[PDB]
Design a protein around this ligand. Structure first.
Ligand code: CA
Ligand code: NA
Ligand code: NA
Length: 487
C-alpha cells in the first residue's frame, strides 16, 4: 500500500465517502440500512485542465450510497434524474427537468407494498418526483412535469422554490416542505431578512405524487433554504438554514441550522434555537449548510455537507461538497444540543459479515480508486465496480467478523486486460497477509471471472484491506464483488 486517504482517514467516519463528491444529503432509513441521496457534485475544469469553482453545471443526477453500520458504504452509483437539454446522454428520467438539486426521499406502504418517492428541485423551476419499487430504483416519472410550481396554491410568495423535504407522518399522511430565498431582490430590508416568509408546507395526496389544498407559510425567522422535518416524542421539528444577511440576534446566528417546533405538521411552528454551526466553524474549505435529521437503528443523527474532500485535494473547498454524519441529541425539555461536527464521526454500530457476497464498492476507506456502473453480469440494481486501480491502491472494510472458525478461501469477481494481484490484509494496509489472489487476464475490462484463493489466519473481528498490485501503469483490473468461505 502506497496510496493515501484523501479526507476520510482509517478509523474515521467523516466524510462518509471521499472517492467522489456528494452534496445536499438526505437520509432514508429502510429495513436495517440508511440510504443517503445527494446532489451530483463533480469537479469542473477550465479549458486548460485546471480546477475551477463549482458552478452546479453537473447537478443533473442523484448519487446514492447506503450503510448498515455507519462506516462501510455501498456505492449505488447515480440516478440519471434530469432528462432535458440532452440528459444524461438521452437516459434522463425526468424529460422536463434540466437539473435535480437537493433530493428528498420517502417510503410509504401503498396497497400493502413499500413504494419509494424521490423528490428534487429543477433549479428554481419547481419540485419533481420519481417513484420506484426499491430505494435504489429503477425510477419512473409518473407525472411528466413538476409536482409543485409557483402556481401551486399557497406557493405564491416563495423566492426560491427549492430544497424539498418530504415527511410521511405516522398516520400515513405525506407532507412537503420547500422554499427559501429572501424577498427584496438586490437589497432586502432588515425586516425582509428577518421574516422572508418564503418557507412553505403543503399536504401531499395519498399517492405521494400530488398535493391536497394549498401551501401554508412557515414564518421561519431569517429563513434561507434547506428545509428539514423530523418528529420526536410527538412534536414536529421544522429545521432550516438561517440566512447571512441583515443584522441577526445572538439566538439566530447567520448560516446555522435553526429549528422550530409544533404539535401539528403544518404549524403553527415556534422558533426554538439552532443546533449546527457553519461548516467552516469546524472544517477547512468553508461552505453553506445543508442537512437532514433522522433516526437509524434507534439513534438520532444529522446528515450534513462540508467541503472536506476538495479542501484536502486543492487547498480550497471551491464549492464542492461531501457528506458527513454526526449524532444528534434531544434534551428532556425537547431542545436539541449543538451538533459536535467532526472527522471522527459515528463509531461502527455493527460488524460486517464477510461470508455473504460483499460488493467491492462496499468499503469504509480507500487509497484512491473510483467506482462506476459495471458491465458484470448479475449483481444488484445499478451494480457498480471498483475501477481506476493502480499499483499501490487499496480499499478497506471496517470490522469484518470472521468468527472463531475463520475463513477458508476468498473469491473476487474481476475483469482484467493484463492481470495483477489482490492482497488480503488484516488491520492495516501493511498488515497481516491472509491471502493473495492472482488476477488473470480475463479477456479485457468487460470480461468477468470469479477467482478463488486460499486464506489462513483470518479469525475474529478486523478491518480488512484489499491491496492491489501489478506491473502495468494504468488500470490493473476492475473489481465487482468478493466473498469469503467459512473454514
Ligand atoms: Ca459490484
Ligand atoms: Na434536503
Ligand atoms: Na487509483
Amino acid at each position: 500500500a502506497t496510496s493515501t486517504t484523501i479526507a476520510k482517514h482509517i478509523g474515521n467516519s467523516n466524510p462518509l465517502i471521499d472517492h467522489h463528491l456528494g452534496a445536499d444529503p438526505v437520509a432514508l432509513t429502510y429495513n436495517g440500512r440508511v440510504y443517503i441521496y445527494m446532489s451530483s457534485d463533480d469537479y469542473e475544469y477550465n479549458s486548460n485542465g485546471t480546477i475551477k469553482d463549482n458552478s452546479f453545471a453537473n447537478l443533473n443526477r442523484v448519487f446514492v450510497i447506503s450503510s448498515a453500520d455507519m462506516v462501510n458504504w455501498t456505492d449505488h452509483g447515480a440516478i440519471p434524474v434530469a432528462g432535458a437539454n440532452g440528459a444524461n446522454g438521452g437516459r434522463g428520467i425526468a424529460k422536463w427537468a434540466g437539473a435535480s438539486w437537493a433530493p428528498s426521499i420517502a417510503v410509504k406502504k401503498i396497497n400493502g407494498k413499500d413504494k419509494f418517492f424521490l423528490y428534487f428541485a429543477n433549479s428554481g423551476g419547481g419540485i419533481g418526483v420519481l417513484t420506484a419499487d426499491s430505494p435504489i430504483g429503477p425510477w419512473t416519472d409518473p407525472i411528466g412535469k413538476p409536482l409543485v410550481t409557483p402556481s401551486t396554491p399557497g406557493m405564491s410568495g416563495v423566492v426560491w422554490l427549492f430544497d424539498p423535504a418530504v415527511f410521511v407522518d405516522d398516520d400515513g399522511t405525506g407532507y412537503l416542505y420547500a422554499g427559501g430565498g429572501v424577498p427584496g431582490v438586490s437589497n432586502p430590508t432588515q425586516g425582509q431578512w428577518a421574516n422572508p416568509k418564503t418557507a412553505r408546507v403543503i399536504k401531499l395526496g395519498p399517492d405521494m405524487t400530488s398535493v391536497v389544498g394549498s401551501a401554508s407559510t412557515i414564518d421561519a425567522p431569517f429563513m434561507f433554504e434547506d428545509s428539514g422535518l423530523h418528529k420526536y416524542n410527538g412534536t414536529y421539528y421544522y429545521s432550516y438554514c438561517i440566512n447571512f444577511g441583515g443584522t441577526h440576534p445572538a439566538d439566530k446566528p447567520p448560516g446555522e441550522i435553526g429549528y422550530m417546533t409544533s404539535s401539528s405538521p403544518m404549524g403553527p411552528f415556534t422558533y426554538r434555537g439552532h443546533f449546527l454551526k457553519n461548516p467552516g466553524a469546524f472544517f477547512g474549505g468553508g461552505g453553506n449548510n445543508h442537512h437532514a435529521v433522522f433516526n437509524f437503528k434507534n439513534e438520532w443523527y444529522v446528515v450534513y455537507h462540508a467541503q472536506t474532500v476538495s479542501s484536502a485535494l486543492f487547498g480550497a473547498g471551491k464549492g464542492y461538497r461531501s457528506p458527513h454524519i454526526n449524532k444528534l441529541v434531544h434534551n428532556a425539555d425537547g431542545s436539541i444540543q449543538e451538533v459536535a461536527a467532526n472527522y471522527a464521526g459515528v463509531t461502527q454500530i455493527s460488524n460486517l459479515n464477510p461470508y455473504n457476497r460483499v460488493e467491492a464498492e462496499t468499503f469504509a476507506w480507500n487509497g484512491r480508486i473510483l467506482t462506476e456502473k459495471s458491465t458484470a453480469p448479475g449483481g444488484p440494481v445499478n451494480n457498480q465496480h471498483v475501477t481506476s486501480i493502480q499499483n499501490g491502491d487499496w480499499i478497506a472494510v471496517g470490522n469484518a467478523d470472521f468468527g472463531a472458525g475463520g475463513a477458508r478461501s476468498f473469491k473476487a469477481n474481476v475483469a482484467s486486460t493484463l492481470g495483477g494481484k489482490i492482497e488480503v490484509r488484516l488491520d492495516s494496509a501493511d498488515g497481516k497477509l491472509v491471502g493473495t489472489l492472482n488476477v488473470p487476464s480475463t479477456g479485457g475490462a468487460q470480461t468477468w471471472r470469479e477467482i478463488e484463493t486460499a486464506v489462513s489466519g483470518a479469525t475474529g473481528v478486523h478491518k480488512v484491506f484489499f491491496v492491489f498490485t501489478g506491473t502495468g501503469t494504468g488500470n490493473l483490473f476492475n473489481f465487482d464483488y468478493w466473498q469469503f468461505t467459512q473454514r
